[PDB]
Structure 1
Amino acid sequence: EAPNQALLRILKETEFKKIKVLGSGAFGTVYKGLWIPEGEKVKIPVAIKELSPKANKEILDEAYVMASVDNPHVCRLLGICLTSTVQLIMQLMPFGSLLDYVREHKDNIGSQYLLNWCVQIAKGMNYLEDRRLVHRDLAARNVLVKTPQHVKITDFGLAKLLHAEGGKVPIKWMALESILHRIYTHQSDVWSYGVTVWELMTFGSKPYDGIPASEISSILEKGERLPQPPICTIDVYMIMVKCWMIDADSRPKFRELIIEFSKMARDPQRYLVIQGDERDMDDVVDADEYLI
C-alpha cells in the first residue's frame, strides 16, 4: 500500500486559550478555544478534545486517521498538543452537530438544506472509501455544522483502514452483518448512512425509540426497518430502505448516493414535502483558509 506522507503537526499549548466547555461525556471533554500561531498574526477558532497510557494510545490513533484525510466534507485536524494526556486540536464547527441543529431549528429547515446535507455526507463518505477507510460510527451526531450550507464528518475514534473487532459500539446505526458478525465494510457505512438520513428526515428522532439494543438484532432479522418519515416521498424513502438491505453488495454505493441526492436537490419540493418550504476578532481566520 502507498506510503502515508501526511504531516503530523505538533502545537505549543502556550498558543491556545480554552474558552468554554463545548461538551462532556463518555469521551474527554471538548473545549471551544482560540489558536494564535506566534508571529503569524492570525486567530484560528479551534475545538480541543482531551480524555493514562491507555488514553494517549487511543487519541494518537485518532490523530493518525484525521491527519491522513483531506476533503472539504471531512473534519480537519490542525495538530496535537504534547500534554501529559494528549490534546487533539481540530477546527471549530460553530453550529454544533447536525443532530442538535436539526432539532433546534426544525421549524426553519427546508428540503433544499436536507438534501444538500445528504449530498455532502455522501461526498465525505465516498472520499473515506477512496482512502480505504471505514468510519464505523456514522450518525447525525458525528456530522458537524460549519455553516448551515456546509457540514463535515467528524468522529474517527472507531475508524479502521481496510474488518473484524471486539468492543462496545452503537447498535441502532449498525449493519446487521456487524451486529451478528463484527464485520465492517464501506457497505456497512452505507447502512449507517441510511439511519443518518432518517435522523435528518425526521428532524432528529431517535431510531427504534425505547427499544433495547438487545432487541434490535432480531427486529432487523425478521425484516423490520425504520418507518417512512412524514416529509418523505417514496423516492427518498426507497433510497434509505436500499441502504438497509441484507445483502451488503445490494445497497447503493456512496458515489451513487451523491448522484441521486444531487438530482433530488435540483427539485427539492418534488422529493421532500415540508409545510411552508418557501419561507476583538479582526484577525480571525477559519482553519480552512489557514494553510501551510
Structure 2
Amino acid sequence: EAPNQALLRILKETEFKKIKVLGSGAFGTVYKGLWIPEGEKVKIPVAIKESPKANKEILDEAYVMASVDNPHVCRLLGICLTSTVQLIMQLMPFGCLLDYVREHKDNIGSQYLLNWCVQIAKGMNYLEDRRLVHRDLAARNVLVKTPQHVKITDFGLAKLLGAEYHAGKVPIKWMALESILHRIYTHQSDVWSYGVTVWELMTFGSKPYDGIPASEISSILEKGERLPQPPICTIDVYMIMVKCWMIDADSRPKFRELIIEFSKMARDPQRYLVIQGDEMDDVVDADEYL
C-alpha cells in the first residue's frame, strides 16, 4: 500500500559502449559493456540484457529491478529505449554461482560456501521485507560480483504481493509441492527453493533429481523422498536443507533465521562442512555510483 517512489532512469544509446557477448539464450542476450553517464567523468562496467509481448515482459522485469536496493540483489542502473528494449545492470564479472562452483570445485572452501548461503538468505529476506516473492531461486540465478560477494538475479518471475500467489514453463525441481500441485507461491515456497539452492552448492553444481522427468517429481516428494545428503555436509547442515523441504510451509525456516544459522556456522566452517584440503582509469563499480 506504500507508494513505489522508485526512479526509472532512461539512458542514451551514446552513453554506453557495448563490448563483448557474455551470453545468449532463451531469456535473451547479455553483453559486457561500459557506461559513461554524460558529464559524470566515470566509466561504469555494466551487463546489457536485450515483439510487444517480449517488450512487455522485459519492462516488468525492469519495474521490479528498479524497485529494489540491497547489497545482495542485482541493481537496474537504467533502461535504453531504442528500436529494442535494453536493461542496463551492474556487471557481475564471475557470472552465475552455479558455473563458478562447477568450475572451481577443487579450490572452493567451506568459508566461501557458508558465506554464499548467508548472502542469499539475506537478499531473500530483503525481498520478503519488500513483499516480493522471487518464484525462480536457483544457483544459476545467483550472480558472483566477487568470490567474496554474491547477488540474487532473474526477476522475470518475481511477483509483488500486497495486503499466496496464484499463477508458462517452470523449474519444477526447485519448486515447492504446493507450487507444483496448485501454483501456490509464497516466501515459504522460496524457502524450498533456497534449500534446493543450498543443495546445488554443497554438491558443487550437481543437477537436482538427476535422471528424473519433472512429471515424476510431484509423486516423489508426495512419497516423502528428498534430495540426498551432499558428502561435504555435516548432519547440522543437511538438517537445514531438510527443514526447507517440509510439506507444512509454516514449518519451513524463515529467511531471517537461516541468516542466523548459516552465520553461526560460518564462525567455524570446518565443523559444518567437510571438504578435502579446506585449509580503464576512471572506472567505478555501480555499488559506488549512487
The two structures have a TM-score, normalised by structure 1, of 0.97
Deviations 1:241-277, CA, capped at 9 Å, x for gaps: 0000000000000000000000000010000000101
Contact map agreement 2:96 2:140 (CA 8 A) in 1: yes
- Give 1:239's aligned residue: 240
The Cα of 1:168 is off from its aligned counterpart by: 1.3
Q: Is the 8 A contact 2:134 2:155 kept in 1?
A: yes
* Shift of residue 167, structure 1, vs aligned partner: 2.2
Check whether the contact 1:34–1:45 (CA below 8 A) recurs between aligned residues. yes
Kept after mapping to 1: 8 A contact 2:131/2:162: no
Q: Is the 8 A contact 1:163 1:183 kept in 2?
A: no
How far the C-alpha of 1:8 sits from its partner, in A, is: 0.4
Q: Distance in 2 between matches of 1:59 and 1:163?
A: 22
Which residues of 2 match residues 250-269 of structure 1 at below 5 A? 250-269=251-270
User: Quick check: 77-86 or 245-254, which moved more?
Assistant: 77-86
Whether contact under 8 Å (2:127, 2:133) holds in the other structure is yes
Deviation at 1:17, TM superposition (A): 1.2
Contact 2:35 2:43 in 1 (8 A): yes
Deviation track 1:82-141 (CA, whole Å, cap 9, x = no partner) reads 012210000000001000100110100000000000000000000000000000000000
Q: Is the 8 A contact 2:120 2:150 kept in 1?
A: yes
SS in 1 for 2:92: coil
How far residue 164 of structure 1 moved from its aligned partner, in angstroms, is 15
Q: Separation in 2 of the partners of 1:83 and 1:140?
A: 32
Distance of 2:171 and 2:12 partners within structure 1:
35
* Whole-angstrom distance in 2 between the partners of 1:20 and 1:217: 41
Distance (Å, rounded) in 2 between the aligned partners of 1:48 and 1:198: 30
Contact 2:122–2:256 (Cα < 8 Å) also in 1: yes
1:93 aligns with 2:92: yes
1:219, CA displacement in angstroms? Answer: 0.8
Kindly provide the CA deviation profile for residues 51-99 of structure 1, in whole angstroms up to 9, marking residues without a partner as x: x111110011010000000110001000100012210000000001000
Structure 1 residue runs of 5 or longer lacking an equivalent are none
8 Å CA contact 1:146, 1:152 repeated in 2: yes
CA distance in 2, matches of 1:132, 1:163: 7
CA contact (8 A) 1:164 1:184 kept: no
Residue aligning to 2:38: 38
Residues 13-43 of structure 1 show CA distances to partners (whole Å, capped at 9, x for unaligned) of 1111111111111111111101111121111
Counterpart residue number, 2:250: 249
TM-align CA RMSD: 1.4
Contact 1:44/1:286 (<8 A) preserved: yes
Q: Structure 1 pair 47/241, CA: closer, same or farther in 2 (3 Å)?
A: same
Deviates more, 1:231-240 or 1:16-25: 16-25
Q: Deviations over 1:176-198 (max 9, x none)?
A: 10000000000000000000000
Judge conservation of contact 1:34–1:43 (CA < 8 Å) in 2: yes
Alpha-carbon distance in 1 for matches of 2:46, 2:270: 37
- State the partner residue of 1:112: 111
Provide the C-alpha distance between the structure 1 equivalents of 2:28 and 2:273, rounded to a whole number of angstroms: 38
Give the equivalent residue in structure 1 for 2:4: 4
After TM superposition, give the deviation of residue 162 of structure 1 in Å: 1.2
Task: Work out the number of aligned pairs and report it.
Answer: 288
Q: 3-state DSSP class of the match of 1:288?
A: helix
Counterpart for residue 229 of structure 1: 230
Which deviates more from structure 2 when the two are superposed, residues 160-169 or residues 109-118?
Answer: 160-169
Work out the CA distance in 2 between the residues paired with 1:202 and 1:130. 30
Provide the rounded CA distance (Å) in 2 between the counterparts of 1:164 and 1:117.
Answer: 32
How far apart are residue 163 of structure 1 and its match?
10
* Superposition deviation, residue 143 in structure 1: 0.4
Q: Identify if the C-alpha distance between structure 1 residues 130 and 29 changes in structure 2 by more than 3 Å, giving closer, same or farther.
A: same
What residue number does 2:128 align with?
129
Contact kept, 8 Å, 2:99 with 2:140, in 1: the verdict is yes
8 Å contact from structure 1 (residues 163, 184) kept in 2:
no
What is the distance in 2 between the residues matched to 1:178 and 1:83?
Answer: 37
TM-score (norm 2): 0.98
Distance in 2, Cα, partners of 1:25 & 1:37 = 29
Superposed displacement of residue 227, structure 1: 0.3
Corresponding residue of 2:205: 204
Judged with a 3 Å threshold, the aligned counterparts in structure 2 of structure 1 residues 151 and 282 are, in CA distance, closer, same or farther, namely same
